[PDB]
Write a protein that binds this DNA or RNA. Sequence first.
DNA 1: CCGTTTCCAACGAAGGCCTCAAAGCGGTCCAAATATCCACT
DNA 2: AGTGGATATTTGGACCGCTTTGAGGCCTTCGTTGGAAACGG
Lengths: 88, 88, 112, 63, 74, 53, 120, 49
Amino acid sequence: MALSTIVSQRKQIKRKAPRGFLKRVFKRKKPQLRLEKSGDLLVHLNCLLFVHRLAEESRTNACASKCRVINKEHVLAAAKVILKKSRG
Amino acid sequence: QPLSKSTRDHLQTMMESVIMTILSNSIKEKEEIQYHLNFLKKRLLQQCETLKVPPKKMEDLTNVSSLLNMERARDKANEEGLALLQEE
Amino acid sequence: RPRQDPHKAGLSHYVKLFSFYAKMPMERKALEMVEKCLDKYFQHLCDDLEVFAAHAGRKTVKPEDLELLMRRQGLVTDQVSLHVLVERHLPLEYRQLLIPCAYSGNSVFPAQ
Amino acid sequence: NIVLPEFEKTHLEHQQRIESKVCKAAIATFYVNVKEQFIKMLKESQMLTNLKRKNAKMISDIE
Amino acid sequence: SGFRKELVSRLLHLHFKDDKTKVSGDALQLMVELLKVFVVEAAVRGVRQAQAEDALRVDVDQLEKVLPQLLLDF
Amino acid sequence: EILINRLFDVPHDPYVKISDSFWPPYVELLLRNGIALRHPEDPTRIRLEAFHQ
Amino acid sequence: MEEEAETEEQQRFSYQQRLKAAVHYTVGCLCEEVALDKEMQFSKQTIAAISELTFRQCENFAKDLEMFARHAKRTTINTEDVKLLARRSNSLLKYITDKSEEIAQINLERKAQKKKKSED
Amino acid sequence: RQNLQMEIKITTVIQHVFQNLILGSKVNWAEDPALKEIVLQLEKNVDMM
DNA sequence: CCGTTTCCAACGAAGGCCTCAAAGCGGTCCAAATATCCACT
DNA sequence: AGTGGATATTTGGACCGCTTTGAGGCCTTCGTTGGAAACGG
């Protein structure tokens, strides 16, 4: 397999969430606010749902645009709608 | 042999549309005039149901003008081609 | 002698989750794209949480703000609440902390 | 072609019942509207069939 | 040549979850102008799509080409 | 007892709609301990796990 | 009992039809005043479609407004909920905020006139 | 025979329900022998009695 | 007696499956930072 | 919560058979096309 192409992961990594990374990001972005006890878990869940939406959209865009391998324009066009739908 | 229900639903949506547009300008005596309109519309539907007519055939009404234009273009093209061939 | 910044180390988890959910071979040029989209999404999420907390009248972020945001996103509704999504997508160690449960003489944890 | 006359006189089957001004105006307006629609759609149908058969004959002639 | 107050008042009251929730005057004033901005935006989007085609008139097709992203924005 | 009765009497439709009497603590306990299962289409209906099968 | 319920349902349906006709007249006026000075012509099907879609979107607007009002423990809707509802795209957000500034200076004018009348 | 089958099924269901309840209640059963006998007799089969 | 609609014979490519060879590296074993964490004070 | 000490983690090093892609063959089966024949004037 070429280094440019990555095969799909047959096994999923452990479902442990990087709570420290999310806390550090939320602190460096908005340091004036304070997150609650387990808000990072809800942020992780929202990120999981966003990634799932983006993945399915990129998959259908790549399979509908005469392609067996996900390219850059496919995920680009998927993000251009997913990012707009994810805000409210 | 009664007609097919395609022209029936076409007529019913056309009559709903014309009732709606004539009601758009109506200001006084709102509810009873539209009540009478739907009553007489259902009565005309019944009268069309009881009527009999020899069978005929055509397609949906949304593609009338487009098909007419395509047939006009094809007629002109065939005419000019036949004229050229005959002159030769 | 490898060197990895915490940002890429944090984003690699979601990148691998995306690669697993795609179920299709993906070019390497899409990884940085997914990372940039994740950064933009995190920025917009932080801004939305900030404005929601400001409108709520308090300085701290509470789970009702995230519930309102997910409801505006179309993910959470009155029938399909947040507990259903937590049970569907999260393991037991997080469900024990998020969803309240009673045991041992009506002892409820967390207090809800 | 045969359904059109009958429906036509249904016009005067309504005039004998309703008597209000604006109701009568709406009746006349929407009735002439649906009549125009009937005539135009049937004329378009006839012209479409004739044009189709003429196109078939003409392509046969050129071939 | 715009929306009326009673129109949108009925529209919002008949679609609410409970009639106990009331609408103030400034909110009702902003609602009609928001609806007007939305409809004029839809119209100008459709006509700009038609100009991208430079067709003869605006019909259902140019509308539905831009229709989804409009409500995706709103 | 209600869940067991619904499972044993109606074999092909053992789902029960969640009521106000079923407060979230006990329902969550039963769902976490694997005793009960939500309906795949609507979480408002729950059933008992078929242990004998 | 069912007959009276069905008559009330039909009365609500006639009310909805009147609202549809009114909003259709309004959107027709708007579209036919923008089309002429935007050098293009419109078809009636597009007018009907925009009418129906505006009617359907008003319900979503009402839902979002009631949600925003409930989130702040307020049974009445104010300008803050209408400003939050427009936060999806910043362009119309700024448009609505400057419109609220206009409403605010109008309220200032009304308050000044009321104080002047009370002075007399 | 049908009564035997029904009793076996009911007993299996009750056994599994009791086991899951004792597990989820988060109680120490080894200290109380009266419950220890039950939790030791729960797992064994019913038809081979 | 002759033109037209229709079923039948036939070439084809078309797709679907099978096989082999070549370039790649993921997986397994292994180093020594180093970073997650749990409570240290 | 700043300070701390410890132990599992992993990423770059190294190597072989599993891995997929590209190409060639070849087959069994539907379809478009030409034509003989029955029907209408």
